[model samples]
Target: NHHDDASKFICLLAKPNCSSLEQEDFIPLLQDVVDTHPGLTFLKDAPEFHSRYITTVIQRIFYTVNRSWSGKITSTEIRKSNFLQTLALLEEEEDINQITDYFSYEHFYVIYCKFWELDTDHDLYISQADLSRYNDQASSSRIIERIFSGAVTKEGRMSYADFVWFLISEEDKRNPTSIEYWFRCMDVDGDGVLSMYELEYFYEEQCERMEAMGIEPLPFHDLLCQMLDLVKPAVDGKITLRDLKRCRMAHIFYDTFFNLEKYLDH
Candidate 1:
């Protein structure tokens, strides 16, 4: 009886356009289900149905139903598959978000929108110049140039896959992979360590970048001392992957020099 209701709901929500949904009906189906659908009673509040999240839920649903990667979602593709079962299992999940972030509408939307702004053509790629526009040009050109110099995205441009990882580490330096990501960008010679020359080169870009944005510039050496002080590197006047891994505050270190906006916010 309940399984029939799920199919029935998909039927009612289906539009006349070949029985498919086009950015429509995800809301009505979910709301209508929550109104009385016994299987989805876990959804107790109408507010759960609210948010700018509406824009992407259909997209995400299509994705989770695993997709045409097309925007349209049709009925049999959902009901014939395990899609309804998929929703029920999710309600059974408490830590659904700790993993499976790709399925989270908000998380997916943040990356997509952030990705689109720089990838203006939607060609699924962005150049170094496009990336610098992030944070209103806060990230240093040394950082940017280093990234394009075969450090991360080697084509002097980034693919969506590359940007996914870039934005991942870009914001969350606390992440272990982020430590490696920034380290590679900073270790200009790819020698597995950050030397004074390499460090100074980035500072060179940051100060010039600051003036371009009308921000105050301080002596780079002062910040340099603090960087070493925090990490307390094993080698004199140098940093290695291990040095950063040891420091619980590497997140602060990366943001200090490269992500000026985040550094200033702190």
Candidate 2:
């Protein structure tokens, strides 16, 4: 299964010493895996579900290599300079010696398998119930309410792209990218800042969910103090996007009102 899961694709992508990689090296070798009895196949046409799927995966590979190609869609091309540029870009996200494995397949395996488990209907999209049930019903209703409110996404359908965005937002609260993601939702008045009204709007629901789960609800005032103490906003009662990222201690900031497992465990 691992071999079938882009293993050779990854093997050729990275060398043992993990230094420079190649466009000529990786993409040209894809056909070997494609011809595997248990894996990918080629089609010279512009049709079919499997073809689109293959293109999407290849697009992801190319997109990962070309950090700036947040282009329209299914853009499956990367220049040699682009790959090296991506290698440099990957360093800012930082860590590790394996230059090529950072764009490897197992991460996609984690993303897809988890997506499969979450999208119970196999519709390639997830629902509020499906997402809320993630990590044993970890998200609070109010938080989920805000999530589904179409503030972040214009539609009700949560696509794989959106799923990736949400998982990153939920999983890493302190990440400025994600901080802004939630910031958009929490800024209900569209004023670009989170006020006490906004804080309690989400927290009230968190309290409700916690009580329902048999944890005693702390007064909103107590949590307000906790948040103020932690975030220490630039001004009274207004937490700006800058403030959220400026704070050193986070995760609990998001978890306190939305993510249940981390909240309860903390």
Candidate 3:
């Protein structure tokens, strides 16, 4: 997986320039995540670290964009939210992304547009120019269509896990932490629960992290669901230590679900 990331370095591979979501760029972003984020490596290898990296990046980006828009949370607030403290609340058994889906990209994008306008160059993560695109959207399906154009494909639609991995790889590099601390600002309700608002805050933080790293991701829907699927309880609303164990177990057993044959061939 680490080498795959390097293979994707076919271009500048930074913020706005890295606009296309082709596997080419995706691989390098994954490489960047593994290479830069020590916490990710400490947790394990590329596959094991991927999900945590995704969730942290999404939450952090959400925080950054929201902060820029709302002035509610700041960088200092983010830094103060250490990794262990947030992990203290997190259910190791729970899938991290399950907790992440509660926040959603739409939730974050709205806040970004509310604060700063979109750029004609398509540089902004939440492009304000596309705001009215949702106006004519009727059914939820149609709304999804407008939001995530060309998202689903034979190669497999980009999942929340994918986007999270992309964003967090960048964040982990920028913040350089031993644990997933970005979740601190994201758990806004302070009930040790992260509702939509907190989730929004989390993505804003990620956007800021990406901005610092110099990159913008292609639009991806289902980002929230992908995240939720990763962390949700095996049964329902409640979280448990068993879930984390299973998650880690799966990570180890699967070894990150990468196709070494394809990876090496590339």
Candidate 4:
């Protein structure tokens, strides 16, 4: 009976002009799935399978109903006739597990909700001011601005994807892809290389913060050698994107420029 109820609920909830399923709905929807498929009752303990299954369900419903690629679903797209067919299509695409393996759907769902809160106007995009709301006492303004400058729409807006990238970078700056992401932002002029001036521009803020804390700022020349040693730049001796990519030590650049406490430690 719960299975029938679950199926009916799925179709009923999806029948609205659902622009998109809110992140808040993920767990409740997943609960229905678990209730319907009693065999998957161990999902909480099986984080890997749990995340994969949850993502599969959401993705199936998303692609089936969001036919217009509007990133949102509509009532017209959710025909009962296509429900089973879409589930089968999703079953065939089990290999489409990219989002689950690295970060669980729960993680993504939380991030998605955060993005929505930041969007404020429900426009599906965040502006510089919207992003600045993330700047807490512990956050550096320079780093926030750098992220906004690089990882945004040409019209200076941030989509869900951009917000995800920024969170990933913040979580692990040493990650090569994350490093490259921020490097592109710090590059500022799109000049393909980070000039000393560009580095200073960002680091100057860090310098002030360190002084405010009565810690002597590390001289830029000394810092350069430390960074060069850590990053091992290409033969030209300039810090290029390739250097950051190859060195895979983006935390160094990030800390040196934005993290006053870490900068003082060095």
Local distance difference test scores for all models: 0.67, 0.61, 0.34, 0.60
Residue 256, candidate 4: C-alpha displacement in angstroms: 1.6
In the predicted model 4, the residue pairs found to clash are 19-72
| Model 3 ranges with Cα > 4 A deviation | 1-186, 218-221, 234-246, 249-266
RMSD in Å for all candidates: 12.0, 10.4, 21.2, 11.7
In the range 1-266, model 4's lDDT, one tens digit per residue, is 33453345445555364433443455566666554443445566777556645654555444334444354443444442255454345334433333233223455556666776788888878877777666343346766776766442246787655566566566667755566666766777777788777777777777777789887877878887777788787743447877777776778667777665565556
Q: What C-alpha lDDT, on a 0 to 100 scale, does residue 225 get in candidate 3?
A: 52
In order of appearance, the predictions have TM-scores of: 0.61, 0.65, 0.22, 0.56
lDDT of 4 at 141: 73
Tell me which of candidates 1 and 3 scores higher on TM-score.
1
Q: Quote the lDDT for 4 in model 2.
A: 33
TM-score of 2: 0.65
> Across residues 1-266, which tens digit of lDDT does each residue of candidate 1 receive?
43474456556776654455655667775455344534334445544333333334444455344244345565555765566666666556644343243335347457768888999766768888888888688687778887788675335668765676677678778756678879989988888899988877877667777788898777887888888898888994678888998988888888887887777787
Q: Put the candidates in TM-score order, highest first.
A: 2, 1, 4, 3
Sorting all predicted structures by lDDT, with the top scorer first, yields 1, 2, 4, 3
Give model 1's TM-score versus the native structure. 0.61
What's model 3's overall lDDT?
A: 0.34
Report how far residue 249 has shifted in candidate 3, in Å. 8.3
The backbone clash count of each candidate, in order, is: 0, 0, 37, 1
After best superposition, candidate 3 residue 229: deviation in angstroms?
Answer: 2.4
Q: Model 2: how large is the Cα RMSD against the reference?
A: 10.4
